[PDB]
């Protein structure tokens, strides 16, 4: 009936002054735009169909044509930026915001989905969706005593759309918009559905990706213990955004970092630093580097949780990107740590895996490792154990590597290696 119609046929039907012919032609468009292989999105746009579909959204008396035009437009809006712009230029945003008030849950859900694709395009369309007043009718759809009474697919679409209103930077979402959405986000962060939890975490990860003022807004809502609980989930789609949110928070103040430690995040790190997914190990090691960039009492919490042997582990064997993040964790620790904490680090066997990485063809990691060697030597000066450390570096072939680095292309590497050889190996 409405399967495999040409764009020409769809235009003929939509241009008839017959509501039923228009409904059949809109369903035919929807079925075309729903096909897996190459939907003719640009052909539908060039035929001037978008304003016609947008005007069908207003046909309150024909709920089927509202659903069909809403689905058709959602599939166009899910395309490239140009294809999303075409939907916005067709006047779809206020028309989709009105549809959130529809008594039909399947039409209302379609409007949610469409707005999520529009807001997801970038900052400008996100902020345009907010200026047309989408947040209040969206949040009113979740104004229920228990989220479990809502349809699973419906709740997942709403959470996803709200996460897209939290997404993108330059600029970040309006503060006022973030303050309005956050109490609903916190509630979704406690829902039992894994997809709702994954998208709620992603929303939190976006809001924590900014200045300390933005991290504060989130931390003050008391979500860090719930993020730490989600950090221990079995589902990788929940752990990934949970770890990103936690990692972002610790880029903030020492006080914000402390909320993460107080919530018990460090107890999850033995499994995160040995996780079979390399992006988890990498981001967990990145999170560690920002905690070792903190206070001496925070470095002490890292020590007390038995995480130093785990940092020795990731430095010894991991994918290069994780090893680079481990080198940063070691330099940060040796920069802010006490003599006792640096002594402990060397005792745990950091020297051999640290010297082995001086063979990597990456100038940033060499600089980071050279800064770490320098800091460790500064602690050995305070103990008069410089000779003992010099022997350890010689014994695992580190001296031969630092000597070679004197004839390096990079100025900073050449100068740092030259200093260590002249100060402790001459």
């Amino acid at each position: 009936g409405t399967v495999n119609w040409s764009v020409e046929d769809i235009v003929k039907g939509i241009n008839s002054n017959n509501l039923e012919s228009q409904l059949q032609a809109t369903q035919a468009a929807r079925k075309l735009l729903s096909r897996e292989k190459q939907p003719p999105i640009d052909n539908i746009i060039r035929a001037g169909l978008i304003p016609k579909f947008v005007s069908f959204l207003g046909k309150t008396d024909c709920s089927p044509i509202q659903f069909e035009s809403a689905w058709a437009l959602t599939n166009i809006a899910s395309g490239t930026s140009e294809q999303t712009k075409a939907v916005v230029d067709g006047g779809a945003i206020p028309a989709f915001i009105s549809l959130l008030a529809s008594p039909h849950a399947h039409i209302s859900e379609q409007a949610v989905w469409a707005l999520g694709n529009i807001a997801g395009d970038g900052s400008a369309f996100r902020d345009l969706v907010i200026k047309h007043g989408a947040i209040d009718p969206l949040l009113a759809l979740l104004a229920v005593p228990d989220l479990s009474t809502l349809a699973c697919g419906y709740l997942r679409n709403l959470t996803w759309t709200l996460s897209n209103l939290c997404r993108n930077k330059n600029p970040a979402p309006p503060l006022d918009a973030v303050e309005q959405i956050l109490p609903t986000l916190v509630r979704l962060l406690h829902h039992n559905d894994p997809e709702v939890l994954a998208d709620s975490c992603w929303a939190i990860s976006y809001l924590t990706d900014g200045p300390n003022e933005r991290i504060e807004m989130v931390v003050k809502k008391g979500v860090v213990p719930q993020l730490v609980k989600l950090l221990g989930a079995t589902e990788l789609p929940i752990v990934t955004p949970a770890l990103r949110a936690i990692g972002n928070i610790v880029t903030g103040t020492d006080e914000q970092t402390q909320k993460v430690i107080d919530a018990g995040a460090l107890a999850v790190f033995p499994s995160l630093l040995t996780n079979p997914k390399t992006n988890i190990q990498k981001e967990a090691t990145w999170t560690m580097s920002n905690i070792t960039a903190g206070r001496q009492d925070q470095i002490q919490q890292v020590v007390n949780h038995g995480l130093v042997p785990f940092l020795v582990g990731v430095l010894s064997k991991a994918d290069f990107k994780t090893q680079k993040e481990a080198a940063w964790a070691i330099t940060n620790y040796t920069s802010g740590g006490t003599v006792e904490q640096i002594v402990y680090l060397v005792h745990c066997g950091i020297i051999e895996p640290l010297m082995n990485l001086l063979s990597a063809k990456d100038t940033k990691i060499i600089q980071v490792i050279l800064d770490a060697i320098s800091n460790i030597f500064q602690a050995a000066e305070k103990l008069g154990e410089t000779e003992k450390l010099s022997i350890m570096i010689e014994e695992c072939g580190g001296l031969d590597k630092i000597e070679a680095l004197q004839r390096h292309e990079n100025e900073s590497v050449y100068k740092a290696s030259l200093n260590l050889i002249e100060k402790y190996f001459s």
Binding site: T74, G79, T84, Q110, W113, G116, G120
Partner: peptide, 6 residues
């Protein structure tokens, strides 16, 4: 992100 309905 953007998502199509199939």
């Amino acid at each position: 992100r953007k998502r199509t309905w199939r």
